[PDB]
Structure 1
Amino acid sequence: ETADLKSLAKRIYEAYLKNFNMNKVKARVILSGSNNPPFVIHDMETLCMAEKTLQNKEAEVRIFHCCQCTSVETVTELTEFAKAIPGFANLDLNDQVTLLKYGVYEAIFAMLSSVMNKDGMLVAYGNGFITREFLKSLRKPFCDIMEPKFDFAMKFNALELDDSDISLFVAAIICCGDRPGLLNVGHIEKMQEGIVHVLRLHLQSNHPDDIFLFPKLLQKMADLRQLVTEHAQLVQIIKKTESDAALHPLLQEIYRDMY
């Protein structure tokens, strides 16, 4: 109706505020501070320094591993976030895992842009900031992991979305009817339609200065799926060629069902 949309939107936004320890506003308040600045990692010296306060494998592999720790935590938060999206809990458990299974990485990269600026990104729960040049100085193929995400982030951040916009966007990413193997594809479809509808109305209302934001945001979902398959391919390549580089068991299984 009209109160049903406020209801849908509000419940989704509160879930977002509840379940994600880190969000765009909080990351911005840090990249600007002061409330204890973020330790900077721009070289091996500071990297080891930062690790000693935030294994014994090669540097590149230790980072590969920490990025995975971040993903695992985000997958957990996304699951709790999803259970709160109106109608998600009513879905069959198999449909819930299928949705989470096929949509966590799109959601992860959609949200990672929040902690990134053109010079680097926030790590260690906000207490650290790693340099983009440093990530690029890493041995190949490890230096190829983050750079593409920075390319995406700069274009995504150019849209200037705030957390309320992002919470709706992530909800739309998760409640996808295209995911293979869905049981009640019809209900999920109704959810998707309602979420995309309120997202668009919310954008027009939250961003009156850019009436073309909705379409530009939708183009991003497209670039995200692309970024993800490219990411998944690089992770497989690294795990397969680099003997010390391993894949966390949960992430290994998620990657198995995506393709």
Structure 2
Amino acid sequence: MEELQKSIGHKPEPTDEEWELIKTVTEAHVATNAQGSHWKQKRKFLPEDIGQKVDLEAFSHFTKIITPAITRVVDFAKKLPMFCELPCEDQIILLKGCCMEIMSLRAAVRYDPESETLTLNGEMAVTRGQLKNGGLGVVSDAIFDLGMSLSSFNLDDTEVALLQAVLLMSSDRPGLACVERIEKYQDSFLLAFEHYINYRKHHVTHFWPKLLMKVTDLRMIGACHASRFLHMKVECPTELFPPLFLEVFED
């Protein structure tokens, strides 16, 4: 009864089914999402003399923690039954597709305006310049800009969880075989997501559509990291890249 409810002007909140789904995804996020309500005291600021060509000292610090952050993204998908309902091959294509998007979202929401830093793997707090010089180049700006911009959105774990699921179920991923099914899943997430937002009633105008634009920028970040990675594989040798990192980001 969606279109009609809208047209009148009712902002529909989550159904019982959608609430169930919401709790499934939220729990999944929070389990694979390093610490909470206290991620700040727990962060250790990277020595300012690191990351002032790829600065290999900085690159090295990032490559140590890049594997756990990646595995936590896979852990998140594992805890989603719809993800399980998919074939070996689609699952892998989906993970490779969304990995940098989710990691980057996760780094973005842990942006702190005071220190002007982001937190990686829940522990490591870096500045724009550090992350840029450590290999990300302009991908660092993109993540920092996103993080500053998201401050106003006041996301909760549930909103970040849903956003993650939407990223995960992207049927445009090349080589997929589950297009129709992956689209059914995403639509299902987007629908719970919007109802959750109606229920949350943020005092930001056009919240929903503004949120959707964030998704797009996260895809831009992913696509761009793909290109950065090519640049790195020339400004550093394969040797420096953790095996999982290579698994995920190179065809």
Query: 5+ residue gaps in structure 1?
Result: 49-57
1:93 paired with 2:93, answer: no
Equivalent residue for 1:230, pick from 216, 224, 247 = 224
Structure 1: how far apart are the matches of 2:121 and 2:184?
Answer: 38
1:40 paired with 2:45, answer: yes
Matched residue type, 1:240: V
Distance 1:133 1:242, change over 3 A: closer
Superimposed CA distance per residue, residues 161-216 of structure 1 (whole angstroms, 9 cap, x where no aligned partner): 12110001101100111111222322222111110100111012123423521111
Aligned to 1:172: 166
Superimposed CA distance per residue, residues 100-142 of structure 1 (whole angstroms, 9 cap, x where no aligned partner): 111111111111112222312335743x533445556x58x66
Distance 1:254 1:135, change over 3 A: closer
Aligned to 1:82: 77
Equivalent residue for 1:122, pick from 105, 119, 122 = 119
Query: 5+ residue gaps in structure 2?
Result: 1-13
Conserved? CA contact 1:113–1:157, under 8 Å: no
Matched residue type, 1:92: P
- What TM-score does the superposition give when structure 1 sets the normalisation length? 0.78
Structure 2 counterparts to residues 1-259 of structure 1, below 5 A: 2-22=15-35, 25-27=37-39, 30=40, 33=41, 38-44=43-49, 47=50, 60-118=55-113, 119-123=116-120, 125-126=122-123, 128-132=124-128, 138=133, 144=138, 146-210=140-204, 212-243=206-237, 246-257=240-251
Tell me how far 1:246 sits from its aligned partner.
2.9
Distance 1:67 1:39, change over 3 A: closer
Identity of aligned residues (%): 24
